Amino acid sequence: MRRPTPTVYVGRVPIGGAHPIAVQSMTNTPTRDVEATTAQVLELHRAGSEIVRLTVNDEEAAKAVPEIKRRLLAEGVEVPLVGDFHFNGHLLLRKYPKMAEALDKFRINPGTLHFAEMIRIAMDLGKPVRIGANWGSLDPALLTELMDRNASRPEPKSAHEVVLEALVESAVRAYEAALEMGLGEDKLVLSAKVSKARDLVWVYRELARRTQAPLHLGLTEAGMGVKGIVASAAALAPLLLEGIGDTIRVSLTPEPRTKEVEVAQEILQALGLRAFAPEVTSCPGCGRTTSTFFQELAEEVSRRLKERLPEWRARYPGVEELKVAVMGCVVNGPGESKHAHIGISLPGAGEEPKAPVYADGKLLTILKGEGIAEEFLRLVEDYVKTRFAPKA
Amino acid sequence: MRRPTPTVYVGRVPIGGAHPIAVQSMTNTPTRDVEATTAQVLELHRAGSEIVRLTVNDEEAAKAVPEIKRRLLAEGVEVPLVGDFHFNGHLLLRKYPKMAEALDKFRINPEHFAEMIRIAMDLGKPVRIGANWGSLDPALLTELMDRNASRPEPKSAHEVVLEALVESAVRAYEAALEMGLGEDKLVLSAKVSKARDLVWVYRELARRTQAPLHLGLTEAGMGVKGIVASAAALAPLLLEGIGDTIRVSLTPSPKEPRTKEVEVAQEILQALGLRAFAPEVTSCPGCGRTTSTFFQELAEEVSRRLKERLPEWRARYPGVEELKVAVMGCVVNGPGESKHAHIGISLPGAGEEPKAPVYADGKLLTILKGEGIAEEFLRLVEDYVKTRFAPKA
């Protein structure tokens, strides 16, 4: 499914086609309030945000930054911070080399015939960059040209659809321009701010076709209503179902921006792109199966997994994604369970009393001990501790 | 951007490619209670729902149906009713003929089913065939699983259950047609639980049948999860131009009517430009072909007058929610950039004669930059509105 891309590390978090789709969010505090900004960053992480943006405007924004990181290091909380910038960000960065290092990525407006400086600064520091096209950063003569071009077409498009062309052109040109300065494909993420599902889908299918950059998906905004939730899912789902998009933000202006993370997290889970808890699946059963045993087994396993969880979670990162399969026949069980981390298949009609256990390959046959259940949880467990060990 | 299908009338409401997507809702009153159910179909309709499903299962409810329709008619509200039936289906219809005739669509899941296609072909009525889990032939599923195992790359057990469900939906379709029921009166569904599944199943059904498609997720309780999942599931399909009726199913707080799910279905349809809460005025962004900012304030005043006329247009002119009005920043490109507007005006940009064309599909007039412009255009809009919408055009 997934669009291949280079990997762009934002701090410790890999962003790109080979990696899990990340959730991003932003502060809502003025950054300058180190007290209220850091609180909000700690909890957005706990909420599910793996990366966190903050707007950085007057000088008062800057001094605050490196301290904010200086306490997160101590607060255990190892989050990557992203700096939201508008023109004058350079002189800001150039003045305080201390905060350029605290930031883990810069977010900048396009520029095409200050953009130069932002790119230059990032290449010195080794910092990745998101280039986010937007209405405000759009070449007026570009717009006019596109407008003229549109009116020559056999079937000219609407005003609004030309705007979207200009937005895409604006993002692609800035992308080529960052690369032209020497930035690096492993240092470059794109996006374009849109307000409607159709627009988002259309703009990002163009960005996919014309660039190899990882893509950060998001809608401009809406209030905390149903509208806002529905719009974001409506808009993100079609892209994520095609394999386009590497980072996602949900934006619903409301104390904090905390409900946004929930929603983003949900959109990912509805489409099976991230899990919060390990999962046991078992086949439906069909004609090959004699016995309810496989199904009682799966309920038991599932039950005993749901209680190892708060241990497993704190001991073993990534374990939320564990898939366990319990199948109803040996002849078809394994083939219907290829994608399980570990699965077992139970004898069916006219089958030997043996139960194969798979961990991608065959791991072992379980002879019909009464203990099959307990033997299997032991295997799930020894599988878990190996495959989900923290691996320095 | 839409799938071609035959047209299925459910009472007043047309359903298929050529028509706007309609939303089915559902009552949770004892159907037997004429006062409670009647009022609920009314609130469900008024929250914006064109089709209402009532539950008929006892003979006590059967004799309430014709009386439910009669009471809605006396309220002037002509919303079509749909019956779902427990097993007593065919029996209750042949026993209560006027209950049968008060319904407009029959729900069936794949004597039995045949004795229900029979009484629908005899009756002139449309049915929805809704495939589902407890309708899969246990033997087919076993067979499909065998086919799957023999594949160079077998799919997951769940992936096979979805094949069984499509096949089971396609078959019951093929069936009804053979039996003697028109493409005229056949709507198709196959409810599943998860977004990806829904997309895969209805792409299958879209490609393999020719039927109008009723898109819905299985029942889930109210929450972020449920709102999101139904948005995540319906959107990718409705973007692709698939589905002709939609239904969001969320479990309401105790004792309450199923109105919020109607609200979400409308928000889903709205978020994709498949439905409009209220008329809207659109204006170009301005480029380089104009330095005049007058088109914007005209658009602002045009939008500010329409918002003043809607409360009356609502109660007076049906359909007009969907009115699109264009106000453009230049004359040489204005008309082209405003083709999907019901009614459009284009102000002179740089170099242009002090003249502004109004369009309504075609060239209508050229309103001479008399200070009147705002009023003259605004007049032409009303001329249009009374002409297009209201009692049949």
Ligand code: SF4
């Ligand atoms: S694993 Fe075996 S028993 Fe289970 S659904 Fe598949 S073929 Fe049937």
Ligand code: SF4
């Ligand atoms: S209609 Fe005219 S002024 Fe308006 S955006 Fe298009 S070319 Fe530019």
